[PDB]
Amino acid sequence: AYTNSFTRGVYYPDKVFRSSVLHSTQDLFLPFFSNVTWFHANPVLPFNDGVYFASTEKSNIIRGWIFGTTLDSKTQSLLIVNNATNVVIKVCEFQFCNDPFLGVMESEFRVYSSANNCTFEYVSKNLREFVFKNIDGYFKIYSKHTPINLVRDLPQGFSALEPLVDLPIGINITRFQTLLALHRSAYYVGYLQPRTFLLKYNENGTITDAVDCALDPLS
């Protein structure tokens, strides 16, 4: 299936506060009214320039992503996981199952079978959006958690995404996947292009509205 975003995938493109103004930016955005894939419950996707990624549930079936160029050994990759404990970022050379996942006893993690040469570690319904990008050896992640009053369909509205993480890795990326918690006892993928937007800033400094300046003559 395919679906239509309406006004989705807007993130704060810098750390700068702004009071009641209209500011114009050039960056990598998800164009308004786009053609976003639909997935149910998954396969190896491309990256090619950033990614928008939403998801919907009350349980937690979406348990992180895996990135990289080959998703195996012989080249390095990232791995972002969340068991019922908390997030586990990790950067080694792995050996990934071609269909990697984790179970739910509650024993799991048939994800990889190798953790060699680790160069970075870290340990510690609902709509959960994420924007992933990778520039100059930094892997930036923006995110937002809005509550839907549906269970698993893409809604309409405006909600800007706030920066979360910054990782000075150096890693090359060309592909990525997803991770799901099996049954033993809905998600979308947009892509980002270089656009020019007009963001409206509140008096507290939040982005409340935007204009995509390449949609139509009025814009």
């Binding site: 750390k15 507290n204 400094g205």
Partner: protein
């Protein structure tokens, strides 16, 4: 090595550590610590917050950033606020007073006395009389109204009477 405590120097064990700094082609990595100093307010200073470099006078403010926002800027894109990275308090930035200086002369063919106007400057930062055109030094403020002789501005004029 059969090391023994009664060995002449040059046969006793030495421990060695070899540090090797390498620079592949990443975006960055470990560096040395950045020393800082206390923050003073209400004086023209040369500040530096994390790389934000400028000069001016810092006061405390009534803004509220967003937890991830590190400094503010206004229309025309000048920095007019900042967050300091240890208190987590936001501070207003105001340029350090400046202006022009004009001298009021009654004509050198009449006298050698002069008055001086410091344009749009408060009088504290330089008998002494505060106009809306700036701070005026060397002229007496009388209460009568004459025709304008030398225009000062915002309704005020000056003149050489009697002698002053």
């Amino acid at each position: 090595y059969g090391f023994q405590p009664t060995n002449g120097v040059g046969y006793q064990p030495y421990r060695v550590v070899v540090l090797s700094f390498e620079l592949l082609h990443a975006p960055a990595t470990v560096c040395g610590p950045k020393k800082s100093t206390n923050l003073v307010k209400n004086k023209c200073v040369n500040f530096n917050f994390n790389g934000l470099t400028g000069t001016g006078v810092l006061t405390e403010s009534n803004k509220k950033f967003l937890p991830f926002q590190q400094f503010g800027r206004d229309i025309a894109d000048t920095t007019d606020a900042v967050r300091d990275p240890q208190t987590l308090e936001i501070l207003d930035i105001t340029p350090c007073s400046f202006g022009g200086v004009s001298v009021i002369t009654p004509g050198t063919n009449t006298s050698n006395q002069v008055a001086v106007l410091y344009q749009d400057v408060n009088c504290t930062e330089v008998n002494v009389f505060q106009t809306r055109a700036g701070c005026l030094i060397g002229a007496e403020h009388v209460n009568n109204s004459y025709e304008c002789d030398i225009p000062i501005g915002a309704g005020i004029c000056a003149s050489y009477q009697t002698q002053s």
